[model samples]
Target: GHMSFLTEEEQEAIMKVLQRDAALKRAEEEDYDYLIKFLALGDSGVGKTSVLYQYTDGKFNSKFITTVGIDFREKRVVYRASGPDGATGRGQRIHLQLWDTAGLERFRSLTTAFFRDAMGFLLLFDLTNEQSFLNVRNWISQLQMHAYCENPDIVLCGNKSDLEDQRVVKEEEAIALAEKYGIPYFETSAANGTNISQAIEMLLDLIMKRMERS
Candidate 1:
């Protein structure tokens, strides 16, 4: 990196141009192939919103906004698979519909249990709260009954991992529970954001494979 008298403003503007080009890959709606619906659920004020917000917006604007009913976010990503023949395969455009269940009024009575709300789920728990992690099973049972089928694609996310030594839930403990459920698990850092995109991508990866198996 070389620095001349180019100043900061021009550098930032050119950087923005590069970033704009980089992010200008896909934007149209009808360009995608499949629409995968994903739902986020867990205890009150867990990292569901943080994970979803981070996944959709690429940043954490989640500070418990005004209470409301269920909400959603939309994004389109290219799903690519490693081919058996060694060549990198093409990517299929995928539209991800993410549902954000606002824990308004506990959400016990207001779940969109109409059976078609999702093909996948992002089940989250706060690392600082043991009860939230415990209730993940309860939420899982609820999903088993209402989500879509007997074994819908699901991912367990333990977010809010800022203070490591102070967390009520440890990594192995959560991994044990996840193994019991037979689902993939990922932990993201604090509300500040980290590793959540991996969580969302893992969910999408699982969902895409599950759909293809049908």
Candidate 2:
């Protein structure tokens, strides 16, 4: 009766708003099954973008480009658990959200904001450049300062391992750093797809383990 008292235009406007809200809800619900968020952290020219591109797209670009702002890529992956003996166990589906950040100092604050909800991190450094490898500590400190979790899942990577001749950061050094931080580390060649998938799998496994513990 009260709806009848309202003009047709008013009723149509109300319906439109309700329909829009419903559509938005539906979109979100259909977006993913279960979701986990991660971030790529490293200095500029460290191949963070290339690492993601290779992992998600299975290709790499030789041309260098810098990440200007915060961006993300998504993929739905089926994660399987492994037994104590390394045998495959039950599996579940998840939406993997990989976020990339600008490595420039000016954007540090902006990028830190994105760390709030990230469940894990891929801390990358250039194997060819020692300075980038050294900066991994500073990045880890920044991550610790901003992330919602006290000890978020982290996997360290020495990128550009394919550039063997140019390698300055040795695998032993990277391993020692990982030991200091008490996290897993890998030597990855984003361009050639060496250990990229394995590193991500290790990180995701850590994240799932963390979730299970909590």
Candidate 3:
């Protein structure tokens, strides 16, 4: 059976909160529990939505459709985090609420509101395109302005890792950028499905640790 990722106390707290509100009880759980919000920030055409769709629905297409204001999707993941024995033998459930935002200039004003209480921030850049990676710093600055500064869990992802020949940004460059920013970095390609699941799971693991601290 597919077990829920929430602990008993967590589940009870959720149910208690839901019981207080009739609308929540009437709506699907997707409207409540299993809601881990992840904000995806990057330049346009950086394959943000594709990375999500690759794991969520396993769909890929050649055409490019820009993500509007903020498109959201719900999905689940089974994270294998270290258990009581400190071995990779434990499975925990995680419900991923992925948020894909439009990086157009017009949407900049609304970006701040979206960063509130974000469980995780995914800063994606195109490996094949230099300009896209360059904007990674700009996006970081934006997040720094609006997001929590101390103990922020940011992941610098160089998307399109499969397009090795076309890739203009090297892995070292991304790593250096992450090091400078003091966050973890990873090279990935949504097209080829490289490190897609690992990226999300690792981010979730870090978020859970943050939750414990709070």
Candidate 4:
């Protein structure tokens, strides 16, 4: 218990603030012990929103609309860790906050400002555009500055694999770049749901394992 003397008028007002602060922090255990956040970032129209939509809800909408600065989706997951040497543990509930942002230069400042708050990133690029692939380095540079840690858990996504006829970025180049960065790489088609869950789950695994280590 916090014992305090009434300091005239100020203590009366201060006690209300202290009680409210305690109210919020106390409910963090109601649903999940850990609130994990993952951000979806990449160039304009690279299917960032679509990929998120497909993962959270089992539907894909091809209609295109700019995400207007930033937006988000939520998904609850049961995370069971694969232990080392048969050391098994019970699955834990996790609430995932997925943040999506517009990658246009106009929104860079507002978007990058949030980089530090996320546990991992889904860095996407259109497989048909060589420039988007080339600009991956710049995005990497941006994350290095504001990420929660140096070398944040990032899964590089070569999206729009459904457009195979227009494909320009080859897997060899993608694999080599992923190798240099030491990150997982996946080519996904949000339209057909190809490798979408695979990429997202891989990212969650990295974040979950990172939490275990820390």
Candidate 5:
């Protein structure tokens, strides 16, 4: 006999029930308190999918498979609001929807079409791939051109830090680019789960701050 906490069949049944209940709860929330959509955009083989998977699923896959079409992952985060004096206060539930788009040139048109729906972006580049680092600017430009907001919240990430030995893109260079664009930046390793959650939290906090100001 198979020993498990829950039978596979039983687990599937419970998952559907939980999903249905979550939907009803979401529908009850006010527009401003609902979901926040963010996008992960970068060149092919830049590890965008791995980063998103690490953030949403708490796991990463080493096997590389290019994303042919767009996909999404969801995570619910409790964003703690700041007090008037800027101290963290009570938390508010935020349903986070992270969209991962294919980075191939042929899918560029399709990916850009949905850019308008994202409230924020996680613009990523490979630390070891100089060309991918260089292409960051074009991605940022396209995001600015198509996103709904004139200057949507964005965080730049230098991925593949685990391969530091093969690194070509310097931290200073990436930092300088981030400074030029007036955005925060992070170095993350999806393979080792370094700074993955921190990057997501940073972008979400920025979006929350903007919403508060507006």
Candidate 6:
């Protein structure tokens, strides 16, 4: 009773990674099936800590303190998929290990360690600030340079989307930047739960499909 637990989309993603050449093959060999870590990162004062807590704990504290070193939380999700024989199936467990790191300029070097084997990155930025949006390039470059694998999945998120009127980063600009780097993008409000769920789901799909294909 053998069953292949993958769909067309999942298969395609795995193939894409495979086609990337020797490095991808190594990644395939080193794949960890049960565990996946995602790093929530961004520049200083970018609301990175607040959003991470909000998503994982569903509580928002206005008087948030900056992260000193790193914080982490584990969330288990049941990812449903068809079996090898295409029969009905369920309960594919996925452990999401969220690594919340500090955002101080002085600690930039120390933060690279967490990027080593991440399944994906959630790049956060403040919508009400232009400088924060511009810093997205720096954040992405740092990730690509420090990650163990090439073209590691990343999602560029403009947090505070609920404060639409006060936003300095236009939706078009954010979309353009994401398109330029070929990564997913969203405007989310951790406070009001705007596009937060959508962004999280999109990143999870990427992570799951990539793993299942391998």
Residue-wise C-alpha lDDT for candidate 4, range 160-196, written one tens digit per residue: 9999999999889999999999999999988889998
Candidate 2 is scored at a TM of 0.84
Q: What does the lDDT come to for candidate 4? A: 0.83
Residue-wise C-alpha lDDT for candidate 3, range 128-188, written one tens digit per residue: 8899988887888878778864556888788888887787887777788889988877788
Q: What is the C-alpha RMSD of each candidate to the true structure, in Å?
A: 12.8, 11.4, 10.9, 10.9, 8.9, 14.1
Task: Assess candidate 5 and give its lDDT.
Answer: 0.84
Model 6 spans with C-alpha error above 4 angstroms: 1-33, 81-89
lDDT of each: 0.72, 0.83, 0.74, 0.83, 0.84, 0.74
Instruction: Report clash pairs, candidate 5.
Output: none
Taking the tens digit of each residue's C-alpha lDDT, what string does model 2 give over 1-214? 1223435764465456446545644666673456787899899889999999999999999898777556677778999887689988777888787888768776667678778758999999999999999999998998888889888789998999899999888778888999998999999999999999999999999988778766
lDDT of 3 at 80: 63
Off by over 4 Å in 2: 1-32
Clashes of each: 0, 0, 0, 0, 0, 2
Model 1: how far residue 204 lies from native, Å:
1.0
Query: lDDT score of model 2?
Result: 0.83
lDDT of 4 at 118: 85
Error of 5 at 94 (Å): 0.6
Ranking 2 against 5 by lDDT, winner:
5
What would the per-residue lDDT of candidate 5 be over residues 1-214, giving only the tens digit for each residue?
Answer: 4333445765575456447545744675623356888989999999999999988787888789877546677788789976778899777888887878878876677678768768999999999999999999888898888989988899999999999899999888899999999999999999999999999999998988888887
TM-score of 5: 0.84
lDDT of 6: 0.74
RMSD of 4: 10.9
